[PDB]
Write a protein that binds this ligand. Structure first.
Ligand code: GNP
Lengths: 122, 44, 119, 267, 54
RNA sequence: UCUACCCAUGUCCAGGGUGAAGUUCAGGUAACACUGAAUGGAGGCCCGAACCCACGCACGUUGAAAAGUGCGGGGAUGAGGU
RNA sequence: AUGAGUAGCGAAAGAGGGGUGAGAAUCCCCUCCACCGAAUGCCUAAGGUUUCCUGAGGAAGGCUCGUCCGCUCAGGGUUAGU
RNA sequence: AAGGAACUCGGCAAAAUGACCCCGUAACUUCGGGAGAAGGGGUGCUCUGUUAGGAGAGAGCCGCAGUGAAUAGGCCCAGGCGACUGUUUAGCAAAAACACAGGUCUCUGCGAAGCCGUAAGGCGAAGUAUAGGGGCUGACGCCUGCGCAACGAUCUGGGCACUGUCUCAACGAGAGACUCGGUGAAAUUAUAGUACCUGUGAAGAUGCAGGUUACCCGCGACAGGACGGAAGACCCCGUGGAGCUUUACUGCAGCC
RNA sequence: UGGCACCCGGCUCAUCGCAUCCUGGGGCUUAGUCGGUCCCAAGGGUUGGGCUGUUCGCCCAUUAAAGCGGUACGCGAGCUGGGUUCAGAACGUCGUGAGACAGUUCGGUCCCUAUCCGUCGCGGGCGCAGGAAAUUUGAGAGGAGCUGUCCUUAGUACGAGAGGACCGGGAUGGACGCACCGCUGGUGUACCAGUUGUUCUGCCAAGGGCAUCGCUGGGUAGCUAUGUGCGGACGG
RNA sequence: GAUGAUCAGGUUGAUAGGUCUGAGGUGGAAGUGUGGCGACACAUGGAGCUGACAGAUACUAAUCGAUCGAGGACUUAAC
């Protein structure tokens, strides 16, 4: 359950290592987000030189959460950290690599490229 | 908190006693007035 | 749910331990009705423990029975009486062993009193 | 980016406009290290039909040659300019005669009109964290204004009667509501004049390092006990030490404003 | 809050309408006891409809 | 006999830290002042109980109390408390 | 008189069995349990002036009850050359 | 649970560190400090083992957790103000206000100068210009304004730790509330058989006019009205007082 | 010894008007995509933050939209000095002395057991032409009423082209509401284990008391949301 | 469920407690053997313990009795 002022950690090789959310898109008074949603965030930790810079405002997709997703058949999934991938408005990976496991829910949200680049999908 | 009255027998007799009243003139006037009224107890 | 008897848990356990060993010695006592209804659940459990009889059961009841003289001449305490000549009395009777017997209220505070005794 | 613009700044403009008539002469304080970017067009639009002089305070921390060149550029532009050091009176003696020469026309007109000459009324205006109160205290020798080493000390305009000769008006610093050119904002943030808790210090440090590498490579070489000019910033940061990964940025900006380096200017 | 006005006798008497007691439960004398209470002992000898106790 | 200041006589302060002057050996010297080592126990010095205050919050405000209680806080060998 | 049989009954662990008695949750005895213990221990100041001990009592006072009391009646009790 | 200041004037409140040893410690400085700076590591039990003389080292054995419960410092940056320790409005203000060590000006030759008293008689002092009264400032280093080293329940701003402050509340314990037995007050009170809506009215209607609703009596809760209750929580006026200042007068003090 | 006009912000709860911000229905002026303007309509909805004294205020990011107003600031016997607003202090400006201005700043005490009318719940009487037990009709009243994307229609209407409707179908969200504990979690003080100090049952082993339930790891029933099911669809 | 009230029962009966089987929770009981110098490990044994949840079983309590509660008004039309 990600919300305002929640610090995630990027899982791609763009140069940003930690972001802080600003708003959750997709509703008049929406206040929570889960796996497979899109958020707007500000970069809080980045290398002095690189593609992205500190203080920049971007948007990302959540891929891991402490509380996972209740699947249809009654199975549950859960991770140990909250991670996001920075994207463009056309839903493509801004970086080149995806690190760590990636939830399968992304596949049903037409995030095909991220799923393809992921090493292991659970 | 300390209340204003802390009893003590010596100081009472030294200040409001009979001999203290009789020492000066105003004390004698006080004794005369109390005798005139007829109070059972006078001085202290 | 269990009654609270208007006391903290530690004091409630203390009262229960006191009363359940006062009853075994005297075999009939007089208390308040709402306090004797909450007592019938423990005495019968202790009586079942006494009816079992093995060593493991005896050490279980030793944690819920206070040290009192009970009988004087032969010097047997509450636990020995419970395991000796009470389990022998209720040998074929399965189920309730106690009887609750109501009576009037008392002058001081109008609480309804009752007498509880072994059957 | 940089947006700092509280409400007292907004009230200052209205107060200045409402008390414009009494003003005789205006002093516009401008930092010497960044003479062009330190000007405020917003307050200049309000200020017209009034003679004025450009003042360059904190002139000890800037290079003499570039400041003198800028002084020439202001002079031949069509405005009088001067270089001043507030903390120790360097050019403070040569401002009263300049004011007298400027206002002599109205002074003689009034004198021939049949009244005794009166005191000169001056208004001091400029961006925050420049010597607009230290200068007044030096001029009055009294230490009557409150000064501090951070922007936003004074909050209300005040009249100061220096003898029977001057009536000075002080004013809290004013910034334009919205910046346009990011380089000007970066320079202003480097020099101070901003609360520094609203901006990104890392970008300021990066700008400082790249400007240094471009302009004063020798001063960057000497630095503080290390001699290298690599491509990134992490080489210099971890000189003297988990250590602060990038909090050393503050250190980079800490010394420069205190002139641990030699005198320099950004122009 | 303090009362705005005193209350008349009629209002007080009407308020005390439901403030009364109840006639107790009356049963037979147990073992020639004295008119004992329902589900309780005889006053004479603690009898239960003739079943004396205590 | 409460509180302000003064006078003459008594009395109280669990424990633990830091280590000034002075002294001795001594690189240094021709010996210093300065190195270190040992000894030494100064201070309106430090942490903190009894004792004395009264900075924050909450309760109480026809109160247990006509200035209190609970949890934190300041001084605690001195221009001290009694 | 109304408010009204309303607010309150002033920090805290007691349970059972015997006894007295016209009347017992509250008085006496016994056994367990529980709290303080740098005192909620003992001894002796200022101060109080019969409150101390024994036998009787149930009007009034004990924020309830009372066969009990620092309450009401009768008696008794305080010994210094250190 | 998830998040971790998003609340709010403000991290107010609560949460978090805390004990014994062993390593390691910055800028600055009045060279004494800062400093327990900041940061790391180890604690249980058994044998070796009169352990050398009470170790230390070694080997081992358990739990999620070893100062296993109670009591023991939260830390780091930047600006003002005051040098410091201390003192103040008992009962609204503990501070930047008072005092303070140092500096400076002025009077005083001894029956001193100043004070208390009508006077006698005293303090100053049994002391004598390196000593006493009365003013102004207020450490010590740099100028005739500039330095914050050390201290602070001081005023402003920032960053870590950490959390029910909150997104958004949910359970649980105790003392009240509620029922029964005993005892049992107070502020207030013109008499009342005491609805609502649009009007009227000294101008803000349970009581007046027109209409609409409403069987009699209680118990547990809320606080819109009775311009609710108790000490007016403030604008005039007292040809009402007291206090205060004199180029308003007139008296008695002292001094010449 | 001039001239001539006027007579407090925040919290918790809401309710009403239309002079309509969005959604519905229309003329229009406007290829469509759109946009502008003017009528009819009050049913529902109408946001989170950073600097800031929220001002004669700046910015960030969303949403179909971030409407204007009345009700003794709507609302203190419901809550907050947080502005206003006192006795202690610094600087100031004016003044011939008793003082004048607040121009800036730091600190700084009010309470209330609900009598009546009102609202929200729960009972006791009697009435209703014979006494009772069930099941009911419905004069009346209250509740609900919101919207976005995506696929088809088919790039078909159009538009030389680029570019593009659309309300008939079909899916699926946001916010709000009503239920419930089968699942994921929370609490769960008479449930089960580990462990520190001290004291007690004559001692060893077994146990009891006290230390916030002594402290830690779990946790059944019940109560619960952050969990699960359903709703606002039309139609006359 | 604040108290009244409502609902399930009153000995042709499963309303409550107890007892016996279960379901969940915890996680390998006491005693006795074996191995080790000892702290400890293994076996007997998914062991022992179990508030509120289920199914059986009258073992203990729901005995007595008391109180209340109708005989259907009048007129006119259709019998
Ligand atoms: N070196 C140097 N420092 C100067 C000079 N003038 C001013 N300063 C520094 O600037 C600070 C004071 O600046 P100040 O005049 O108060 O700035 P401001 O514009 O008045 N700020 P505000 O208006 O908000 O009160 C001090 O740190 C002072 O040392 C100068 O000429 N040289």
């Amino acid at each position: 359950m990600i919300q305002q002022e929640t610090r995630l950690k990027v899982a791609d090789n763009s140069g940003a290592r930690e972001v802080l959310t600003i708003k959750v898109l997709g509703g008049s008074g929406r206040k929570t987000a889960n796996i497979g949603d899109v958020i707007v965030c500000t970069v809080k930790q980045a290398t002095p030189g690189g593609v992205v810079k500190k203080g920049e405002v971007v948007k990302a997709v959540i891929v891991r959460t402490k509380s996972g997703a209740r699947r249809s058949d009654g199975s549950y999934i859960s991770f140990d950290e909250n991670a996001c991938v920075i994207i463009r408005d056309d839903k493509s990976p801004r970086g080149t690599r995806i690190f760590g496991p990636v939830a399968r829910e992304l596949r049903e949200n037409n995030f095909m490229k991220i799923v393809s680049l992921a090493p292991e999908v659970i | 908190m300390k209340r204003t009255f802390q009893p003590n027998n010596r100081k009472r007799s030294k200040v409001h006693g009979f001999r203290s009243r009789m020492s000066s003139k105003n004390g004698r006037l006080v004794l005369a007035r109390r005798r005139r009224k007829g109070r059972k107890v006078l001085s202290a | 749910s269990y009654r609270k008897l208007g006391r903290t848990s530690a004091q409630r356990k203390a009262m229960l331990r006191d009363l359940t060993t006062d009853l075994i010695i005297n075999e009939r006592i007089e208390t308040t009705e709402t306090r004797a209804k909450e007592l019938r659940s423990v005495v019968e459990k202790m009586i079942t423990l006494g009816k079992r009889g093995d060593l493991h059961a005896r050490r279980q009841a030793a944690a819920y029975i206070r040290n009192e003289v009970a009988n004087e001449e032969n010097n047997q305490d509450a636990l020995q009486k419970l395991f000796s000549d009470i389990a022998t009395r209720y040998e074929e009777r399965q189920g309730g062993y106690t009887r609750i017997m109501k009576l009037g209220p008392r002058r001081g505070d109008g609480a309804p009193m009752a007498i509880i005794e072994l059957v | 980016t940089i947006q700092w613009f509280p409400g007292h700044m907004a009230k200052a403009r209205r107060e200045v406009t409402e008390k414009l008539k009494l003003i005789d002469i205006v002093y516009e304080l401008v930092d010497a290290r960044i003479p062009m970017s330190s000007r405020n067009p917003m307050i200049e639009d309000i200020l017209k039909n009034k003679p004025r002089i450009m003042l360059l305070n904190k002139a000890d921390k800037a290079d003499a040659a570039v400041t003198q060149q800028w002084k020439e550029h202001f002079e031949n532009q069509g405005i009088r300019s001067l270089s001043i050091n507030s903390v120790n009176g360097q050019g403070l003696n040569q401002i009263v005669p300049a004011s007298k020469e400027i206002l002599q026309e109205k002074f003689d007109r009034m004198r021939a009109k049949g009244v005794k000459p009166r005191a000169i009324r001056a208004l001091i205006i400029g961006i925050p964290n420049v010597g607009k109160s230290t200068l007044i205290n030096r001029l009055a020798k009294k230490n009557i204004a409150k000064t501090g080493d951070r922007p936003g000390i004074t909050t209300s305009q005040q009249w100061v009667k220096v003898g029977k000769e001057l009536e000075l008006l002080d004013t809290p610093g004013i910034l334009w509501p919205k910046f346009e050119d990011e380089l000007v904002g970066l320079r202003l943030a480097v020099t101070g004049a901003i609360k520094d808790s609203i901006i990104n210090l890392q970008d300021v440090a990066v700008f400082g390092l790249r400007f240094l590498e471009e302009h004063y490579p020798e001063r960057l070489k000497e630095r503080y006990g290390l001699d290298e000019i690599p491509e990134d910033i992490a080489e210099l940061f971890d000189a003297i030490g988990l250590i602060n990964y990038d909090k050393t940025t503050e250190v980079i900006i800490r010394d420069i404003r205190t002139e641990k380096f030699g005198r320099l200017s950004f122009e | 809050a303090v009362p705005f006005r005193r209350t008349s006798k009629m209002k007080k008497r009407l308020r005390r309408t439901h403030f009364k007691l109840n006639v107790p439960g009356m049963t037979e004398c147990p073992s020639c006891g004295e008119m004992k209470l329902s589900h309780r002992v005889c006053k004479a000898c603690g009898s239960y409809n003739g079943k004396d106790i205590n």
